[PDB]
Amino acid sequence: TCPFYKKIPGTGFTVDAFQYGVVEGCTAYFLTHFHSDHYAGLSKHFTFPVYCSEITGNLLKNKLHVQEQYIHPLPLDTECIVNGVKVVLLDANHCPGAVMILFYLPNGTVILHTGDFRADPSMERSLLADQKVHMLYLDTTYCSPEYTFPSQQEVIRFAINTAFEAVTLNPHALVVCGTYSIGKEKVFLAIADVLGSKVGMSQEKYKTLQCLNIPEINSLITTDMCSSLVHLLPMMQINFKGLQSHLKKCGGKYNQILAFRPTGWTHSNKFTRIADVIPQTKGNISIYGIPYSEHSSYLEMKRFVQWLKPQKIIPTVNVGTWKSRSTMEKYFREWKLEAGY
Ligand code: NI
């Protein structure tokens, strides 16, 4: 049944709760972002109000065929009224269109639901600074101290330098980037920019990117694979068999692949720096795993929560095992004792 951490007390609301059928008492279904574990269950047959960002609303209409009369897009950073309750959507620094939701309950309680987010100090100057939050529904994906990773800026610098060097040494190399959902567009767009190429992709992915309000996107992406030297493929296909196969398909226009797999975390991060990453190579194919994360590191998450000082924390990730839950609750107590709230 619908878990408690998907329900907003004192309202008829749920968050990211589309795979349970009709949730009893739910008058408004919010969707934080367009990732399949969160939207799972939506289709053209859904007839309840869905509240989301403009970008998420474009993807619901164009990719899932949800009928327009049930899509309620809200602007960001704007106080809005939903079934009598004041709400605000905030940028979550996750994938395009991803939001955090602030609920102002009639009784005076203020609730923040982070959806999926990558905490950042810029958040400390949004509408969040203006009032107290009593309950925080927190994206705890990486809530353990082993999870460190570099800034997004450092990772894109490594990728741009690597690609530029490879293609300048060999003008017949192809760059390939893996994807399985929206998010991490900076990876392939930054590489294409430094090489003076558009990114080539399938018609289905091109359609997806045209939903995102990314400025000048017509200038950066294309469905013509041949004219392009940065290709996007399903993440599944980013391996030696998949890549040897793809290389056949270009008809000897290319003699070398350099491929990027933007993973979240992998255990080379506890040891290795970004400057010290190496690929896996077979023949004329090299694969680089780069730690480009759209979720908070442990230290980013800890800073955000010690700034906000919530009265109660409700984890939304890693909640399925007793040892995970108990470990997270021990970190929350450390944070509160160190900070004095
Ligand atoms: Ni997500």
Side-chain angles (χ1 to χ4, degrees), residues 1-23 25-203 205-215 217-240 242-247 249-269 271-281 283-311 313-341:
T1 68
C2 184
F4 73 100
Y5 63 86
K6 292 189 185 281
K7 296 171 165 196
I8 303 308
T11 68
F13 303 159
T14 57
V15 179
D16 296 350
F18 296 92
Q19 68 167 278
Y20 307 94
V22 180
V23 174
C26 186
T27 62
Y29 294 78
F30 287 74
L31 181 58
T32 63
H33 65 292
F34 196 79
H35 279 165
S36 60
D37 280 354
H38 300 259
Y39 62 74
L42 276 163
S43 73
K44 72 166 73 174
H45 307 297
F46 197 84
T47 50
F48 299 95
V50 180
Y51 284 90
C52 61
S53 70
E54 171 171 8
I55 284 162
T56 298
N58 297 339
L59 290 155
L60 286 180
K61 173 186 169 169
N62 292 285
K63 301 291 293 187
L64 298 187
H65 307 291
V66 173
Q67 303 172 32
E68 213 143 2
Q69 69 166 132
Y70 306 110
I71 308 172
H72 302 251
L74 316 167
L76 299 200
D77 305 314
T78 298
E79 296 185 321
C80 299
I81 308 298
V82 173
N83 296 352
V85 174
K86 177 161 67 170
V87 306
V88 172
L89 301 192
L90 302 164
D91 204 284
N93 191 34
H94 180 58
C95 63
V99 299
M100 316 191 287
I101 312 158
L102 257 181
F103 301 94
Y104 293 82
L105 265 49
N107 74 9
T109 306
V110 179
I111 293 174
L112 181 59
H113 194 303
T114 67
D116 281 347
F117 85 142
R118 183 162 185 181
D120 190 72
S122 68
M123 292 169 180
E124 301 165 15
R125 300 172 272 286
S126 67
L127 294 198
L128 281 181
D130 300 16
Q131 84 294 274
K132 190 186 165 55
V133 174
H134 300 81
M135 308 179 78
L136 174 65
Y137 289 62
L138 179 61
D139 172 15
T140 45
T141 296
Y142 298 128
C143 189
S144 196
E146 66 272 33
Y147 296 111
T148 54
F149 29 62
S151 73
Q152 287 179 168
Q153 189 268 328
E154 296 173 75
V155 171
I156 290 300
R157 178 92 292 205
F158 169 85
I160 284 167
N161 291 349
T162 302
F164 179 73
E165 176 196 317
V167 179
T168 297
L169 298 171
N170 182 188
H172 305 273
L174 167 59
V175 178
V176 178
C177 291
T179 186
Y180 41 32
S181 55
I182 63 169
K184 311 190 187 184
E185 287 83 6
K186 194 72 172 171
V187 182
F188 51 90
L189 303 172
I191 290 166
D193 182 72
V194 85
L195 300 180
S197 187
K198 300 196 183 189
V199 185
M201 63 192 72
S202 70
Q203 292 176 238
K205 186 69 185 177
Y206 183 92
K207 179 183 183 193
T208 299
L209 300 189
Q210 286 290 167
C211 295
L212 305 185
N213 299 352
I214 288 179
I217 203 67
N218 295 336
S219 63
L220 320 163
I221 62 168
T222 183
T223 56
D224 181 3
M225 303 293 290
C226 284
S227 84
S228 145
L229 64 144
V230 183
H231 297 171
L232 306 194
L233 296 181
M235 198 73 86
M236 280 203 67
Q237 199 175 342
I238 312 302
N239 57 71
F240 296 114
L243 290 167
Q244 284 171 204
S245 191
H246 187 72
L247 195 42
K249 282 165 245 187
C250 304
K253 202 164 204 289
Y254 306 104
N255 59 359
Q256 177 184 11
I257 279 172
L258 181 102
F260 294 90
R261 291 190 350 96
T263 62
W265 169 83
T266 62
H267 186 69
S268 12
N269 274 325
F271 305 120
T272 324
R273 275 173 152 77
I274 190 61
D276 317 343
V277 166
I278 63 172
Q280 263 200 213
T281 299
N284 61 338
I285 292 173
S286 285
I287 306 172
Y288 278 92
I290 56 173
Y292 192 94
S293 184
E294 289 189 340
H295 298 267
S296 311
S297 74
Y298 172 85
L299 290 168
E300 290 168 347
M301 186 190 307
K302 176 174 186 275
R303 178 185 166 111
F304 177 80
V305 174
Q306 290 185 304
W307 173 79
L308 192 69
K309 304 173 171 70
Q311 294 181 2
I313 303 172
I314 303 180
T316 64
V317 188
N318 305 307
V319 296
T321 82
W322 298 118
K323 190 177 158 221
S324 307
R325 287 193 158 278
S326 169
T327 300
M328 293 185 296
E329 295 183 22
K330 289 175 36 268
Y331 297 132
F332 304 150
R333 190 55 56 164
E334 291 176 20
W335 300 354
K336 175 177 162 93
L337 293 170
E338 185 195 18
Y341 51 105

PDB file of all heavy atoms in Angstrom, residues 74-103:
ATOM      1  N   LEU A  74       2.843  24.540 -12.351  1.00  0.00           N
ATOM      2  CA  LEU A  74       3.046  25.764 -11.543  1.00  0.00           C
ATOM      3  C   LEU A  74       4.415  26.378 -11.801  1.00  0.00           C
ATOM      4  O   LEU A  74       5.410  25.601 -11.998  1.00  0.00           O
ATOM      5  CB  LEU A  74       2.915  25.483 -10.043  1.00  0.00           C
ATOM      6  CG  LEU A  74       1.751  24.601  -9.591  1.00  0.00           C
ATOM      7  CD1 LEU A  74       1.785  24.066  -8.113  1.00  0.00           C
ATOM      8  CD2 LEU A  74       0.504  25.456  -9.800  1.00  0.00           C
ATOM      9  N   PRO A  75       4.501  27.720 -11.835  1.00  0.00           N
ATOM     10  CA  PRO A  75       5.777  28.411 -11.918  1.00  0.00           C
ATOM     11  C   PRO A  75       6.579  28.217 -10.654  1.00  0.00           C
ATOM     12  O   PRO A  75       5.989  27.974  -9.592  1.00  0.00           O
ATOM     13  CB  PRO A  75       5.391  29.908 -12.013  1.00  0.00           C
ATOM     14  CG  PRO A  75       4.076  29.998 -11.357  1.00  0.00           C
ATOM     15  CD  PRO A  75       3.402  28.658 -11.476  1.00  0.00           C
ATOM     16  N   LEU A  76       7.896  28.354 -10.757  1.00  0.00           N
ATOM     17  CA  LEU A  76       8.769  28.228  -9.630  1.00  0.00           C
ATOM     18  C   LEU A  76       8.817  29.514  -8.847  1.00  0.00           C
ATOM     19  O   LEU A  76       8.490  30.595  -9.414  1.00  0.00           O
ATOM     20  CB  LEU A  76      10.234  27.943 -10.157  1.00  0.00           C
ATOM     21  CG  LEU A  76      10.517  26.677 -10.988  1.00  0.00           C
ATOM     22  CD1 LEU A  76      12.018  26.326 -10.980  1.00  0.00           C
ATOM     23  CD2 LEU A  76       9.790  25.424 -10.613  1.00  0.00           C
ATOM     24  N   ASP A  77       9.194  29.450  -7.568  1.00  0.00           N
ATOM     25  CA  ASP A  77       9.464  30.598  -6.711  1.00  0.00           C
ATOM     26  C   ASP A  77       8.258  31.536  -6.595  1.00  0.00           C
ATOM     27  O   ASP A  77       8.429  32.738  -6.344  1.00  0.00           O
ATOM     28  CB  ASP A  77      10.725  31.348  -7.169  1.00  0.00           C
ATOM     29  CG  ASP A  77      11.956  30.420  -7.258  1.00  0.00           C
ATOM     30  OD1 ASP A  77      12.219  29.632  -6.342  1.00  0.00           O
ATOM     31  OD2 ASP A  77      12.679  30.512  -8.259  1.00  0.00           O
ATOM     32  N   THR A  78       7.082  30.940  -6.603  1.00  0.00           N
ATOM     33  CA  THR A  78       5.800  31.670  -6.626  1.00  0.00           C
ATOM     34  C   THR A  78       4.763  31.055  -5.688  1.00  0.00           C
ATOM     35  O   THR A  78       4.488  29.855  -5.799  1.00  0.00           O
ATOM     36  CB  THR A  78       5.203  31.569  -8.038  1.00  0.00           C
ATOM     37  OG1 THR A  78       6.083  32.196  -8.985  1.00  0.00           O
ATOM     38  CG2 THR A  78       3.778  32.273  -8.104  1.00  0.00           C
ATOM     39  N   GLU A  79       4.169  31.857  -4.790  1.00  0.00           N
ATOM     40  CA  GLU A  79       3.214  31.320  -3.847  1.00  0.00           C
ATOM     41  C   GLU A  79       1.926  31.025  -4.629  1.00  0.00           C
ATOM     42  O   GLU A  79       1.409  31.914  -5.371  1.00  0.00           O
ATOM     43  CB  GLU A  79       2.982  32.332  -2.698  1.00  0.00           C
ATOM     44  CG  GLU A  79       4.175  32.652  -1.810  1.00  0.00           C
ATOM     45  CD  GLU A  79       3.779  33.555  -0.654  1.00  0.00           C
ATOM     46  OE1 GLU A  79       2.961  34.451  -0.916  1.00  0.00           O
ATOM     47  OE2 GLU A  79       4.215  33.357   0.491  1.00  0.00           O
ATOM     48  N   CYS A  80       1.448  29.769  -4.563  1.00  0.00           N
ATOM     49  CA  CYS A  80       0.283  29.297  -5.311  1.00  0.00           C
ATOM     50  C   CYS A  80      -0.684  28.624  -4.330  1.00  0.00           C
ATOM     51  O   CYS A  80      -0.255  28.159  -3.278  1.00  0.00           O
ATOM     52  CB  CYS A  80       0.637  28.251  -6.343  1.00  0.00           C
ATOM     53  SG  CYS A  80       1.777  28.710  -7.657  1.00  0.00           S
ATOM     54  N   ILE A  81      -1.981  28.581  -4.658  1.00  0.00           N
ATOM     55  CA  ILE A  81      -2.970  27.927  -3.770  1.00  0.00           C
ATOM     56  C   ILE A  81      -3.482  26.655  -4.457  1.00  0.00           C
ATOM     57  O   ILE A  81      -3.973  26.685  -5.573  1.00  0.00           O
ATOM     58  CB  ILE A  81      -4.165  28.854  -3.362  1.00  0.00           C
ATOM     59  CG1 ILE A  81      -3.749  30.231  -2.780  1.00  0.00           C
ATOM     60  CG2 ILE A  81      -5.106  28.121  -2.393  1.00  0.00           C
ATOM     61  CD1 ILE A  81      -2.945  30.260  -1.496  1.00  0.00           C
ATOM     62  N   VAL A  82      -3.339  25.515  -3.786  1.00  0.00           N
ATOM     63  CA  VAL A  82      -3.863  24.231  -4.287  1.00  0.00           C
ATOM     64  C   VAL A  82      -4.884  23.654  -3.290  1.00  0.00           C
ATOM     65  O   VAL A  82      -4.540  23.315  -2.162  1.00  0.00           O
ATOM     66  CB  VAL A  82      -2.719  23.190  -4.595  1.00  0.00           C
ATOM     67  CG1 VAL A  82      -3.253  21.811  -4.957  1.00  0.00           C
ATOM     68  CG2 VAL A  82      -1.856  23.671  -5.748  1.00  0.00           C
ATOM     69  N   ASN A  83      -6.142  23.482  -3.732  1.00  0.00           N
ATOM     70  CA  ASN A  83      -7.241  22.988  -2.887  1.00  0.00           C
ATOM     71  C   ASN A  83      -7.180  23.616  -1.552  1.00  0.00           C
ATOM     72  O   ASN A  83      -7.183  22.924  -0.500  1.00  0.00           O
ATOM     73  CB  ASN A  83      -7.194  21.462  -2.687  1.00  0.00           C
ATOM     74  CG  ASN A  83      -7.382  20.691  -3.966  1.00  0.00           C
ATOM     75  OD1 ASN A  83      -7.701  21.245  -5.036  1.00  0.00           O
ATOM     76  ND2 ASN A  83      -7.186  19.377  -3.868  1.00  0.00           N
ATOM     77  N   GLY A  84      -7.004  24.917  -1.549  1.00  0.00           N
ATOM     78  CA  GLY A  84      -6.958  25.671  -0.330  1.00  0.00           C
ATOM     79  C   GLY A  84      -5.737  25.732   0.491  1.00  0.00           C
ATOM     80  O   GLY A  84      -5.803  26.226   1.575  1.00  0.00           O
ATOM     81  N   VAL A  85      -4.605  25.211  -0.009  1.00  0.00           N
ATOM     82  CA  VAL A  85      -3.360  25.154   0.754  1.00  0.00           C
ATOM     83  C   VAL A  85      -2.266  25.886  -0.051  1.00  0.00           C
ATOM     84  O   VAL A  85      -2.140  25.662  -1.239  1.00  0.00           O
ATOM     85  CB  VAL A  85      -2.908  23.678   0.971  1.00  0.00           C
ATOM     86  CG1 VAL A  85      -1.530  23.557   1.651  1.00  0.00           C
ATOM     87  CG2 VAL A  85      -3.936  22.929   1.789  1.00  0.00           C
ATOM     88  N   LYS A  86      -1.543  26.774   0.625  1.00  0.00           N
ATOM     89  CA  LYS A  86      -0.460  27.560  -0.031  1.00  0.00           C
ATOM     90  C   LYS A  86       0.759  26.568  -0.208  1.00  0.00           C
ATOM     91  O   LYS A  86       1.138  25.873   0.771  1.00  0.00           O
ATOM     92  CB  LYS A  86       0.002  28.747   0.836  1.00  0.00           C
ATOM     93  CG  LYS A  86       1.166  29.529   0.234  1.00  0.00           C
ATOM     94  CD  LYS A  86       1.391  30.954   0.792  1.00  0.00           C
ATOM     95  CE  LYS A  86       1.816  30.989   2.203  1.00  0.00           C
ATOM     96  NZ  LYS A  86       2.230  32.400   2.571  1.00  0.00           N
ATOM     97  N   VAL A  87       1.247  26.534  -1.441  1.00  0.00           N
ATOM     98  CA  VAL A  87       2.465  25.742  -1.833  1.00  0.00           C
ATOM     99  C   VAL A  87       3.402  26.608  -2.668  1.00  0.00           C
ATOM    100  O   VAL A  87       2.988  27.591  -3.357  1.00  0.00           O
ATOM    101  CB  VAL A  87       2.075  24.481  -2.623  1.00  0.00           C
ATOM    102  CG1 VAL A  87       1.067  23.608  -1.884  1.00  0.00           C
ATOM    103  CG2 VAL A  87       1.497  24.803  -3.989  1.00  0.00           C
ATOM    104  N   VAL A  88       4.709  26.259  -2.647  1.00  0.00           N
ATOM    105  CA  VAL A  88       5.749  26.896  -3.485  1.00  0.00           C
ATOM    106  C   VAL A  88       6.612  25.748  -4.068  1.00  0.00           C
ATOM    107  O   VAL A  88       6.968  24.836  -3.321  1.00  0.00           O
ATOM    108  CB  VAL A  88       6.640  27.776  -2.634  1.00  0.00           C
ATOM    109  CG1 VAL A  88       7.834  28.301  -3.429  1.00  0.00           C
ATOM    110  CG2 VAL A  88       5.850  28.993  -2.092  1.00  0.00           C
ATOM    111  N   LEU A  89       6.933  25.812  -5.359  1.00  0.00           N
ATOM    112  CA  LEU A  89       7.913  24.887  -5.987  1.00  0.00           C
ATOM    113  C   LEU A  89       9.273  25.557  -6.058  1.00  0.00           C
ATOM    114  O   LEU A  89       9.366  26.714  -6.517  1.00  0.00           O
ATOM    115  CB  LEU A  89       7.489  24.483  -7.411  1.00  0.00           C
ATOM    116  CG  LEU A  89       6.142  23.760  -7.664  1.00  0.00           C
ATOM    117  CD1 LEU A  89       5.978  23.180  -9.044  1.00  0.00           C
ATOM    118  CD2 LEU A  89       5.767  22.763  -6.568  1.00  0.00           C
ATOM    119  N   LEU A  90      10.347  24.833  -5.637  1.00  0.00           N
ATOM    120  CA  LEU A  90      11.739  25.341  -5.631  1.00  0.00           C
ATOM    121  C   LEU A  90      12.620  24.479  -6.529  1.00  0.00           C
ATOM    122  O   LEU A  90      12.366  23.299  -6.688  1.00  0.00           O
ATOM    123  CB  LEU A  90      12.309  25.387  -4.225  1.00  0.00           C
ATOM    124  CG  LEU A  90      11.531  26.255  -3.197  1.00  0.00           C
ATOM    125  CD1 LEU A  90      11.975  25.889  -1.806  1.00  0.00           C
ATOM    126  CD2 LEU A  90      11.717  27.736  -3.482  1.00  0.00           C
ATOM    127  N   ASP A  91      13.623  25.083  -7.176  1.00  0.00           N
ATOM    128  CA  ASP A  91      14.553  24.280  -7.958  1.00  0.00           C
ATOM    129  C   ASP A  91      15.343  23.270  -7.077  1.00  0.00           C
ATOM    130  O   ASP A  91      15.818  23.602  -6.029  1.00  0.00           O
ATOM    131  CB  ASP A  91      15.491  25.182  -8.781  1.00  0.00           C
ATOM    132  CG  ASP A  91      16.049  24.395 -10.036  1.00  0.00           C
ATOM    133  OD1 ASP A  91      16.904  23.601  -9.780  1.00  0.00           O
ATOM    134  OD2 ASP A  91      15.563  24.508 -11.231  1.00  0.00           O
ATOM    135  N   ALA A  92      15.282  21.983  -7.503  1.00  0.00           N
ATOM    136  CA  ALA A  92      15.898  20.899  -6.727  1.00  0.00           C
ATOM    137  C   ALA A  92      17.397  20.631  -7.150  1.00  0.00           C
ATOM    138  O   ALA A  92      18.076  19.780  -6.488  1.00  0.00           O
ATOM    139  CB  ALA A  92      15.093  19.588  -6.969  1.00  0.00           C
ATOM    140  N   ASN A  93      17.913  21.302  -8.178  1.00  0.00           N
ATOM    141  CA  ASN A  93      19.281  20.958  -8.687  1.00  0.00           C
ATOM    142  C   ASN A  93      19.469  19.456  -8.876  1.00  0.00           C
ATOM    143  O   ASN A  93      20.493  18.896  -8.471  1.00  0.00           O
ATOM    144  CB  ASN A  93      20.327  21.508  -7.735  1.00  0.00           C
ATOM    145  CG  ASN A  93      21.740  21.445  -8.287  1.00  0.00           C
ATOM    146  OD1 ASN A  93      21.932  21.592  -9.508  1.00  0.00           O
ATOM    147  ND2 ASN A  93      22.742  21.200  -7.412  1.00  0.00           N
ATOM    148  N   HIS A  94      18.487  18.843  -9.547  1.00  0.00           N
ATOM    149  CA  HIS A  94      18.508  17.397  -9.884  1.00  0.00           C
ATOM    150  C   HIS A  94      18.559  17.345 -11.417  1.00  0.00           C
ATOM    151  O   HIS A  94      19.572  17.892 -11.984  1.00  0.00           O
ATOM    152  CB  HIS A  94      17.383  16.656  -9.151  1.00  0.00           C
ATOM    153  CG  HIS A  94      17.287  15.151  -9.407  1.00  0.00           C
ATOM    154  ND1 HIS A  94      18.340  14.279  -9.142  1.00  0.00           N
ATOM    155  CD2 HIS A  94      16.255  14.363  -9.790  1.00  0.00           C
ATOM    156  CE1 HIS A  94      17.953  13.039  -9.348  1.00  0.00           C
ATOM    157  NE2 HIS A  94      16.721  13.064  -9.807  1.00  0.00           N
ATOM    158  N   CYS A  95      17.564  16.771 -12.076  1.00  0.00           N
ATOM    159  CA  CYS A  95      17.448  16.800 -13.567  1.00  0.00           C
ATOM    160  C   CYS A  95      16.507  17.962 -14.019  1.00  0.00           C
ATOM    161  O   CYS A  95      15.862  18.625 -13.188  1.00  0.00           O
ATOM    162  CB  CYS A  95      16.878  15.483 -14.028  1.00  0.00           C
ATOM    163  SG  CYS A  95      15.151  15.148 -13.409  1.00  0.00           S
ATOM    164  N   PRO A  96      16.429  18.230 -15.324  1.00  0.00           N
ATOM    165  CA  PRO A  96      15.552  19.296 -15.764  1.00  0.00           C
ATOM    166  C   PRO A  96      14.083  19.117 -15.319  1.00  0.00           C
ATOM    167  O   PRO A  96      13.544  18.007 -15.368  1.00  0.00           O
ATOM    168  CB  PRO A  96      15.667  19.236 -17.323  1.00  0.00           C
ATOM    169  CG  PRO A  96      17.133  18.740 -17.521  1.00  0.00           C
ATOM    170  CD  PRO A  96      17.227  17.655 -16.418  1.00  0.00           C
ATOM    171  N   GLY A  97      13.514  20.246 -14.826  1.00  0.00           N
ATOM    172  CA  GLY A  97      12.143  20.239 -14.336  1.00  0.00           C
ATOM    173  C   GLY A  97      11.916  19.715 -12.903  1.00  0.00           C
ATOM    174  O   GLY A  97      10.769  19.748 -12.398  1.00  0.00           O
ATOM    175  N   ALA A  98      12.996  19.220 -12.259  1.00  0.00           N
ATOM    176  CA  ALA A  98      12.896  18.670 -10.883  1.00  0.00           C
ATOM    177  C   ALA A  98      12.732  19.760  -9.851  1.00  0.00           C
ATOM    178  O   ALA A  98      13.461  20.773  -9.902  1.00  0.00           O
ATOM    179  CB  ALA A  98      14.102  17.786 -10.560  1.00  0.00           C
ATOM    180  N   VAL A  99      11.783  19.540  -8.925  1.00  0.00           N
ATOM    181  CA  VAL A  99      11.413  20.515  -7.853  1.00  0.00           C
ATOM    182  C   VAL A  99      11.393  19.908  -6.472  1.00  0.00           C
ATOM    183  O   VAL A  99      11.247  18.701  -6.315  1.00  0.00           O
ATOM    184  CB  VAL A  99      10.036  21.208  -8.118  1.00  0.00           C
ATOM    185  CG1 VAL A  99      10.104  21.974  -9.429  1.00  0.00           C
ATOM    186  CG2 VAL A  99       8.866  20.176  -8.059  1.00  0.00           C
ATOM    187  N   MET A 100      11.622  20.771  -5.480  1.00  0.00           N
ATOM    188  CA  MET A 100      11.267  20.617  -4.069  1.00  0.00           C
ATOM    189  C   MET A 100       9.908  21.335  -3.856  1.00  0.00           C
ATOM    190  O   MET A 100       9.603  22.281  -4.595  1.00  0.00           O
ATOM    191  CB  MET A 100      12.333  21.180  -3.126  1.00  0.00           C
ATOM    192  CG  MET A 100      13.774  20.771  -3.567  1.00  0.00           C
ATOM    193  SD  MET A 100      14.992  21.158  -2.267  1.00  0.00           S
ATOM    194  CE  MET A 100      15.103  22.937  -2.352  1.00  0.00           C
ATOM    195  N   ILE A 101       9.119  20.875  -2.870  1.00  0.00           N
ATOM    196  CA  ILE A 101       7.765  21.468  -2.611  1.00  0.00           C
ATOM    197  C   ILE A 101       7.666  21.886  -1.159  1.00  0.00           C
ATOM    198  O   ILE A 101       7.876  21.051  -0.265  1.00  0.00           O
ATOM    199  CB  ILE A 101       6.633  20.471  -2.931  1.00  0.00           C
ATOM    200  CG1 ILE A 101       6.806  19.798  -4.299  1.00  0.00           C
ATOM    201  CG2 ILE A 101       5.273  21.210  -2.879  1.00  0.00           C
ATOM    202  CD1 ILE A 101       6.058  18.506  -4.401  1.00  0.00           C
ATOM    203  N   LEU A 102       7.290  23.155  -0.930  1.00  0.00           N
ATOM    204  CA  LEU A 102       7.026  23.699   0.378  1.00  0.00           C
ATOM    205  C   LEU A 102       5.517  23.762   0.571  1.00  0.00           C
ATOM    206  O   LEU A 102       4.845  24.281  -0.324  1.00  0.00           O
ATOM    207  CB  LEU A 102       7.580  25.106   0.429  1.00  0.00           C
ATOM    208  CG  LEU A 102       8.824  25.445   1.107  1.00  0.00           C
ATOM    209  CD1 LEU A 102       8.937  26.992   0.903  1.00  0.00           C
ATOM    210  CD2 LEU A 102       8.973  24.949   2.545  1.00  0.00           C
ATOM    211  N   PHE A 103       5.024  23.103   1.623  1.00  0.00           N
ATOM    212  CA  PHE A 103       3.577  23.118   1.998  1.00  0.00           C
ATOM    213  C   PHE A 103       3.378  23.947   3.266  1.00  0.00           C
ATOM    214  O   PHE A 103       4.018  23.704   4.278  1.00  0.00           O
ATOM    215  CB  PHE A 103       3.098  21.659   2.274  1.00  0.00           C
ATOM    216  CG  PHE A 103       3.259  20.695   1.102  1.00  0.00           C
ATOM    217  CD1 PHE A 103       4.425  19.893   1.014  1.00  0.00           C
ATOM    218  CD2 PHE A 103       2.314  20.565   0.122  1.00  0.00           C
ATOM    219  CE1 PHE A 103       4.564  19.012  -0.046  1.00  0.00           C
ATOM    220  CE2 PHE A 103       2.424  19.640  -0.924  1.00  0.00           C
ATOM    221  CZ  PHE A 103       3.565  18.864  -0.997  1.00  0.00           C
TER     222      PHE A 103
END
